[PDB]
Write an enzyme that holds these catalytic residues in place. Sequence first.
Site, PDB file in Angstrom:
ATOM      1  N   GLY A  97     -28.173  43.374  57.425  1.00  0.00           N
ATOM      2  CA  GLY A  97     -28.407  43.545  55.994  1.00  0.00           C
ATOM      3  C   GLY A  97     -27.574  44.638  55.351  1.00  0.00           C
ATOM      4  O   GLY A  97     -26.417  44.840  55.732  1.00  0.00           O
ATOM      5  N   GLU A  98     -28.161  45.356  54.364  1.00  0.00           N
ATOM      6  CA  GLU A  98     -27.483  46.436  53.624  1.00  0.00           C
ATOM      7  C   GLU A  98     -28.372  47.683  53.417  1.00  0.00           C
ATOM      8  O   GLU A  98     -29.595  47.611  53.547  1.00  0.00           O
ATOM      9  CB  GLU A  98     -26.968  45.934  52.254  1.00  0.00           C
ATOM     10  CG  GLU A  98     -28.051  45.420  51.307  1.00  0.00           C
ATOM     11  CD  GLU A  98     -27.712  45.387  49.827  1.00  0.00           C
ATOM     12  OE1 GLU A  98     -26.513  45.484  49.473  1.00  0.00           O
ATOM     13  OE2 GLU A  98     -28.657  45.263  49.014  1.00  0.00           O
ATOM     14  N   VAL A  99     -27.733  48.817  53.087  1.00  0.00           N
ATOM     15  CA  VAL A  99     -28.383  50.094  52.791  1.00  0.00           C
ATOM     16  C   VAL A  99     -28.076  50.448  51.328  1.00  0.00           C
ATOM     17  O   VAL A  99     -26.910  50.422  50.924  1.00  0.00           O
ATOM     18  CB  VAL A  99     -27.974  51.235  53.771  1.00  0.00           C
ATOM     19  CG1 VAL A  99     -28.619  52.561  53.379  1.00  0.00           C
ATOM     20  CG2 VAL A  99     -28.335  50.884  55.208  1.00  0.00           C
ATOM     21  N   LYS A 128     -33.006  50.907  53.648  1.00  0.00           N
ATOM     22  CA  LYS A 128     -32.383  49.968  54.575  1.00  0.00           C
ATOM     23  C   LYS A 128     -33.104  48.634  54.410  1.00  0.00           C
ATOM     24  O   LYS A 128     -34.318  48.557  54.617  1.00  0.00           O
ATOM     25  CB  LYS A 128     -32.433  50.499  56.022  1.00  0.00           C
ATOM     26  CG  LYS A 128     -31.489  49.782  56.982  1.00  0.00           C
ATOM     27  CD  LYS A 128     -31.424  50.453  58.351  1.00  0.00           C
ATOM     28  CE  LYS A 128     -30.401  51.563  58.402  1.00  0.00           C
ATOM     29  NZ  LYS A 128     -30.369  52.240  59.726  1.00  0.00           N
ATOM     30  N   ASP A 132     -24.986  56.067  69.995  1.00  0.00           N
ATOM     31  CA  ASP A 132     -23.850  55.671  69.155  1.00  0.00           C
ATOM     32  C   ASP A 132     -23.416  56.805  68.227  1.00  0.00           C
ATOM     33  O   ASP A 132     -23.125  56.574  67.057  1.00  0.00           O
ATOM     34  CB  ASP A 132     -24.147  54.384  68.352  1.00  0.00           C
ATOM     35  CG  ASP A 132     -22.905  53.661  67.831  1.00  0.00           C
ATOM     36  OD1 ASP A 132     -21.802  53.873  68.397  1.00  0.00           O
ATOM     37  OD2 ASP A 132     -23.033  52.893  66.863  1.00  0.00           O
ATOM     38  N   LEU A 170     -24.714  51.822  49.929  1.00  0.00           N
ATOM     39  CA  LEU A 170     -24.275  52.916  50.790  1.00  0.00           C
ATOM     40  C   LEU A 170     -23.479  52.412  52.006  1.00  0.00           C
ATOM     41  O   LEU A 170     -22.751  53.191  52.620  1.00  0.00           O
ATOM     42  CB  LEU A 170     -25.474  53.778  51.230  1.00  0.00           C
ATOM     43  CG  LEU A 170     -26.187  54.561  50.121  1.00  0.00           C
ATOM     44  CD1 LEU A 170     -27.340  55.358  50.682  1.00  0.00           C
ATOM     45  CD2 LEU A 170     -25.216  55.467  49.337  1.00  0.00           C
ATOM     46  N   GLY A 171     -23.591  51.120  52.301  1.00  0.00           N
ATOM     47  CA  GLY A 171     -22.863  50.485  53.393  1.00  0.00           C
ATOM     48  C   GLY A 171     -23.429  49.160  53.859  1.00  0.00           C
ATOM     49  O   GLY A 171     -24.398  48.650  53.288  1.00  0.00           O
ATOM     50  N   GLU A 172     -22.810  48.598  54.919  1.00  0.00           N
ATOM     51  CA  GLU A 172     -23.210  47.336  55.544  1.00  0.00           C
ATOM     52  C   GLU A 172     -23.655  47.578  56.997  1.00  0.00           C
ATOM     53  O   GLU A 172     -22.933  48.216  57.770  1.00  0.00           O
ATOM     54  CB  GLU A 172     -22.061  46.315  55.483  1.00  0.00           C
ATOM     55  N   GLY A 173     -24.845  47.079  57.337  1.00  0.00           N
ATOM     56  CA  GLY A 173     -25.428  47.195  58.670  1.00  0.00           C
ATOM     57  C   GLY A 173     -25.681  45.854  59.327  1.00  0.00           C
ATOM     58  O   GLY A 173     -24.758  45.224  59.847  1.00  0.00           O
TER      59      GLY A 173
HETATM   60  N1  LIG Z   1     -26.131  55.682  58.714  1.00  0.00           N
HETATM   61  C1  LIG Z   1     -26.997  54.697  58.313  1.00  0.00           C
HETATM   62  O1  LIG Z   1     -28.209  54.794  58.558  1.00  0.00           O
HETATM   63  C2  LIG Z   1     -26.429  53.489  57.632  1.00  0.00           C
HETATM   64  C3  LIG Z   1     -26.446  52.271  58.354  1.00  0.00           C
HETATM   65  C4  LIG Z   1     -25.766  51.151  57.855  1.00  0.00           C
HETATM   66  C5  LIG Z   1     -25.059  51.239  56.637  1.00  0.00           C
HETATM   67  C6  LIG Z   1     -25.066  52.432  55.890  1.00  0.00           C
HETATM   68  C7  LIG Z   1     -25.773  53.558  56.371  1.00  0.00           C
HETATM   69  C8  LIG Z   1     -25.891  54.740  55.481  1.00  0.00           C
HETATM   70  C9  LIG Z   1     -27.160  55.208  55.132  1.00  0.00           C
HETATM   71  C10 LIG Z   1     -27.296  56.342  54.357  1.00  0.00           C
HETATM   72  C11 LIG Z   1     -26.173  57.078  53.919  1.00  0.00           C
HETATM   73  C12 LIG Z   1     -24.891  56.592  54.251  1.00  0.00           C
HETATM   74  C13 LIG Z   1     -24.764  55.402  55.034  1.00  0.00           C
HETATM   75  N2  LIG Z   1     -23.696  57.252  53.916  1.00  0.00           N
HETATM   76  C14 LIG Z   1     -23.392  57.750  52.624  1.00  0.00           C
HETATM   77  C15 LIG Z   1     -22.115  57.439  52.069  1.00  0.00           C
HETATM   78  C16 LIG Z   1     -21.714  57.985  50.845  1.00  0.00           C
HETATM   79  C17 LIG Z   1     -22.577  58.839  50.145  1.00  0.00           C
HETATM   80  C18 LIG Z   1     -23.835  59.141  50.666  1.00  0.00           C
HETATM   81  C19 LIG Z   1     -24.263  58.602  51.917  1.00  0.00           C
HETATM   82  N3  LIG Z   1     -25.533  59.011  52.375  1.00  0.00           N
HETATM   83  C20 LIG Z   1     -26.445  58.368  53.224  1.00  0.00           C
HETATM   84  O2  LIG Z   1     -27.558  58.957  53.354  1.00  0.00           O
END
Ligand SMILES: NC(=O)c1ccccc1-c1ccc2c(c1)Nc1ccccc1NC2=O
Length: 268
Positions: A17-19, A34, A118, A13-16
């Site tokens: 580690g990873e999700v 997470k 943020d 779902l992305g890079e923070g």
């Molecule tokens: N916003 C976060 O908590 C986060 C932090 C670091 C990296 C990625 C995320 C994150 C977590 C969950 C989702 C997300 C990013 N975005 C996303 C992107 C595409 C499709 C579904 C989601 N949903 C989600 O629930």
Amino acid sequence: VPFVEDWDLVQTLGEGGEVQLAVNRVTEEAVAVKIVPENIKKEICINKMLNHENVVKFYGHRREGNIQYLFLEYCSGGELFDRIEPDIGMPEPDAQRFFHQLMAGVVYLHGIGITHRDIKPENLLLDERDNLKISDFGLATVFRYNNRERLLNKMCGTLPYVAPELLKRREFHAEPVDVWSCGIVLTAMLAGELPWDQPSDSCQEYSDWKEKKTYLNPWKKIDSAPLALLHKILVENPSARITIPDIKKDRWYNKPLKKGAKRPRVTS
Ligand SMILES: NC(=O)c1ccccc1-c1ccc2c(c1)Nc1ccccc1NC2=O
């Protein structure tokens, strides 16, 4: 019931580690996991506080040695960021609905003495019904405890969305900082562009705004009613800046614009 604790990691779902997007082996329930020091211990602690329809839900956490797993609500609609068309924005009724949900979420957080610090469209997640959810409490902190306010001094956020007092003053109140980032989010939704790199006098775009040059972009793309609200939010002095109770009284905020979700219907 066996295997109900097993989750398959199906997509990053992305890079923070990873999700990761995790799917339950038995129920097929989707959750966001997470995968990661004292910084994560604070995120878990603040998340255990949160319970609101416009805040990403925390289901729990598990530790497997050096790796910490945070089980969070999955928002299938993705990020608000990808609903914003570059240099265009989105239809004004959609932006008004997203801004209402953003305010409900921020009112909740400030009510329990939490500041996100943020707020930006990358962190504002959407569920299946396009309900906005505030996410990522990695930079969040407690600004009110035992009914005593703690003034902040730490530099954080993302520069285009940070309030000008963070760059100018040693200390500042937490709440007007989140109100400012919400105003930059509102600007992005209605114009499809960020007004400045940072809110400083060295930034020509920021000086143009303080001089009320609204014939320039992004303000030229924004109707007079939401622009009058942006004039009250993006006020350099945080003590003169509109509070959320007064945002809720603004004419555009209370303007009937959007129809309810298209419900199935037949004729004759
Ligand atoms: N916003 C976060 O908590 C986060 C932090 C670091 C990296 C990625 C995320 C994150 C977590 C969950 C989702 C997300 C990013 N975005 C996303 C992107 C595409 C499709 C579904 C989601 N949903 C989600 O629930």
